[PDB]
Design a protein around this ligand. Sequence first.
Ligand SMILES: NC(=O)c1ccc[n+]([C@@H]2O[C@H](COP(=O)([O-])OP(=O)(O)OC[C@H]3O[C@@H](n4cnc5c(N)ncnc54)[C@H](OP(=O)(O)O)[C@@H]3O)[C@@H](O)[C@H]2O)c1
Ligand SMILES: Cc1cc2nc(-c3cscn3)n(-c3ccc4c(N)nc(N)nc4c3)c2cc1C
Length: 157
Amino acid sequence: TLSILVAHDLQRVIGFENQLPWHLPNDLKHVKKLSTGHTLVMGRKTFESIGKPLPNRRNVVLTSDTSFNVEGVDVIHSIEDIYQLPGHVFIFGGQTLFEEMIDKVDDMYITVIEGKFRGDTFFPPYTFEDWEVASSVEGKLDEKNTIPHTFLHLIRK
Ligand SMILES: NC(=O)c1ccc[n+]([C@@H]2O[C@H](COP(=O)([O-])OP(=O)(O)OC[C@H]3O[C@@H](n4cnc5c(N)ncnc54)[C@H](OP(=O)(O)O)[C@@H]3O)[C@@H](O)[C@H]2O)c1
Ligand SMILES: Cc1cc2nc(-c3cscn3)n(-c3ccc4c(N)nc(N)nc4c3)c2cc1C
């Protein structure tokens, strides 16, 4: 299985100044749960944003940098390399990766951030004519999680 993992707002903002525009612990727990024991593929910028590989999963970084050789990280240099990775593969971002892979993935796990944030990077447009709603689950709000959010699982029709 090849999947997208993404958090985007009402206008498909995904990022601002190489970070998430929102603080939402529950989204990070959601991502952690879904990808534990599986594979994450991310762009170089996204990896430098996170700063270190995520534990208990395979971290794969796509970059043109031939000097890239980071402890606990596997490196790929082409989009084609993704299809040779075994198991459940999750496209982890960022904008460039999502744009390159939205037409290729089997399904998408989306956290819709039900707000309007300032962004400089975006998830590409998509229509529900192409995607079946496998599940839609309203995130629970509390002191630590104050922005309404919905977890969508979409499967390509
Ligand atoms: N909300 C979310 O779910 C989410 C998730 C992840 C990231 N983000 C956000 O997304 C933004 C980053 O997105 P971005 O598009 O600027 O950067 P990015 O996708 O994370 O990475 C861009 C880099 O990926 C490498 N790359 C991509 N395609 C390649 C290819 N086909 N061959 C070789 N290298 C390739 C290149 O690295 P080199 O220049 O080193 O060659 C490129 O500069 C940030 O704001 C971040 O916070 C949001
Ligand atoms: C502990 C932790 C820290 C994180 N920092 C970030 C981050 C920094 S800049 C852009 N994202 N994330 C990330 C990285 C990728 C995704 C994704 N594809 N989808 C979703 N929904 N959330 C993410 C959170 C993170 C995810 C986790 C689990």
